[PDB]
Amino acid sequence: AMPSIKLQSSDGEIFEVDVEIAKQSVTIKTMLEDDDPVPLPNVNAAILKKVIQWCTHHKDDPPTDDIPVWDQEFLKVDQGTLFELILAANYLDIKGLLDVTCKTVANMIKGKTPEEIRKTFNDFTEEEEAQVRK
Amino acid sequence: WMQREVWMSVFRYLSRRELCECMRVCKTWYKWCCD
Amino acid sequence: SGMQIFVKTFRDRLRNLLPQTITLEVEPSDTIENVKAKIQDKEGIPPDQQVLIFSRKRLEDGRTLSDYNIQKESTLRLVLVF
């Protein structure tokens, strides 16, 4: 009494998810145009679940600091997995997740000095810092 | 690789002032903001 | 000794590429890795950043088009991976 499609992850773990939320990823619904798990390249089975939680929450959305409250708490995850969430929202073509995750990294870069930016995620000569200032 | 297109995308949301300081972070970033 | 294949793409948003369909002149004995490099020549994306899927099965990089029964005028949606 509910529609379901299989989605094979990069690891190989198949996910039986509803088509109404899989349709949130426009690459999956367009892949069905013109009874097998649809492939999700470069998307691990762990990130796939994190992708589902964001999509299954945004099932009622058709497409100034606009960061949502629940999403910014949903993105209280390690920096590594956040980058793995940006790439997926490009592979699955998720305009909401692609923007919320990119705006959050920019929020991590904004308001900080270049050293404070590098200290969060990490190669200059002594004049290279002065030459870049020019 | 993987760092070019993702970092260039977060640069669009940062205002023109933030991209000015973004060049002094790294050389790979310095080559990216000038494209 | 040469066929024609189209490979439709998907909307990529990190790379501002609209969904298009690249046309290829290949042979059924060409491996998936070869036809991935035949996409490299016209655009410049390495085969390690490409994914071919004919119907619902990811195309392995070590098999020819004859293994997946890829005939002429067949469309293979390609997906980029970082």
From Swiss-Prot, chain A:
Any one Gene Ontology molecular-function term assigned to this protein's record: F-box domain binding
Phosphothreonine PTM positions: T113
Subunit composition and interactions: Interacts with KDM2B, forming heterodimers. The KDM2B-SKP1 heterodimeric complex interacts with the PCGF1-BCORL heterodimeric complex to form a homotetrameric polycomb repression complex 1 (PRC1.1). Component of multiple SCF (SKP1-CUL1-F-box) E3 ubiquitin-protein ligase complexes formed of CUL1, SKP1, RBX1 and a variable F-box domain-containing protein as substrate-specific subunit. Component of the SCF(FBXW11) complex containing FBXW11. Component of the SCF(SKP2) complex containing SKP2, in which it interacts directly with SKP1, SKP2 and RBX1. (Microbial infection) Interacts with vaccinia virus protein C9L.
Region (Interaction with the F-box domain of F-box proteins): 86-134
Post-translational modifications: Undergoes autophagy-mediated degradation in the liver in a time-dependent manner.
Gene: SKP1
Taxonomy, superkingdom: Eukaryota
Gene Ontology terms: cellular component: centrosome; Cul7-RING ubiquitin ligase complex; cytoplasm; cytosol; nucleoplasm; nucleus; PcG protein complex; SCF ubiquitin ligase complex
Protein's name in the database: S-phase kinase-associated protein 1
Source species: Homo sapiens
Family per record: Belongs to the SKP1 family.
Coiled-coil ranges from the UniProt annotation: none
InterPro entries: SKP1 (IPR016897), SKP1-like (IPR001232), SKP1-like_dim_sf (IPR036296), SKP1/BTB/POZ_sf (IPR011333), Skp1_comp_dimer (IPR016072), Skp1_comp_POZ (IPR016073)
Pathway membership, UniProt: Protein modification; protein ubiquitination
Keywords on record: Host-virus interaction, Isopeptide bond, Phosphoprotein, Ubl conjugation, Ubl conjugation pathway
Xref: Pfam families: Skp1, Skp1_POZ
Species classification: Eukaryota, Metazoa, Chordata, Craniata, Vertebrata
PANTHER family cross-referenced by the UniProt entry: SKP1 (PTHR11165)
BP GO terms, sorted: chromatin remodeling; maintenance of protein location in nucleus; positive regulation of ubiquitin protein ligase activity; proteasome-mediated ubiquitin-dependent protein catabolic process; protein K48-linked ubiquitination; protein monoubiquitination; protein polyubiquitination; protein ubiquitination
From Swiss-Prot, chain B:
Domain F-box: 1-35
Signal sequence interval, chain numbering: none
Tissues with expression: Widely expressed, with highest levels in brain, testis and ovary, followed by lung.
Transmembrane segment boundaries: none
Location in or out of the cell: Nucleus, Nucleoplasm; Chromosome
Assembly and interaction partners: Interacts with CBX5/HP1A; the interaction promotes CBX5 localization to chromatin. The SKP1-KDM2A complex interacts with UBB. Part of a SCF (SKP1-cullin-F-box) protein ligase complex.
Primary role: Histone demethylase that specifically demethylates 'Lys-36' of histone H3, thereby playing a central role in histone code. Preferentially demethylates dimethylated H3 'Lys-36' residue while it has weak or no activity for mono- and tri-methylated H3 'Lys-36'. May also recognize and bind to some phosphorylated proteins and promote their ubiquitination and degradation. Required to maintain the heterochromatic state. Associates with centromeres and represses transcription of small non-coding RNAs that are encoded by the clusters of satellite repeats at the centromere.
Entry text on domains: The JmjC domain mediates demethylation activity and is required for satellite silencing.
Family: Belongs to the JHDM1 histone demethylase family.
Name under which the protein is recorded: Lysine-specific demethylase 2A
Organism of derivation: Homo sapiens (Human)
Taxonomic path: Eukaryota, Metazoa, Chordata, Craniata, Vertebrata
Gene (name only): KDM2A
Residues of the full protein shown: 892 to 926 of 1162
Swiss-Prot record, chain C:
Domain Ubiquitin-like: 3-79
Cellular compartments annotated: Cytoplasm; Nucleus; Mitochondrion outer membrane
Membrane topology: Peripheral membrane protein
Superkingdom of source: Eukaryota
PTM annotation: Phosphorylated ubiquitin specifically binds and activates parkin (PRKN), triggering mitophagy. Phosphorylation does not affect E1-mediated E2 charging of ubiquitin but affects discharging of E2 enzymes to form polyubiquitin chains. It also affects deubiquitination by deubiquitinase enzymes such as USP30.
Function, as annotated: Exists either covalently attached to another protein, or free (unanchored). When covalently bound, it is conjugated to target proteins via an isopeptide bond either as a monomer (monoubiquitin), a polymer linked via different Lys residues of the ubiquitin (polyubiquitin chains) or a linear polymer linked via the initiator Met of the ubiquitin (linear polyubiquitin chains).
Protein name: Ubiquitin
Lineage: Eukaryota, Metazoa, Chordata, Craniata, Vertebrata
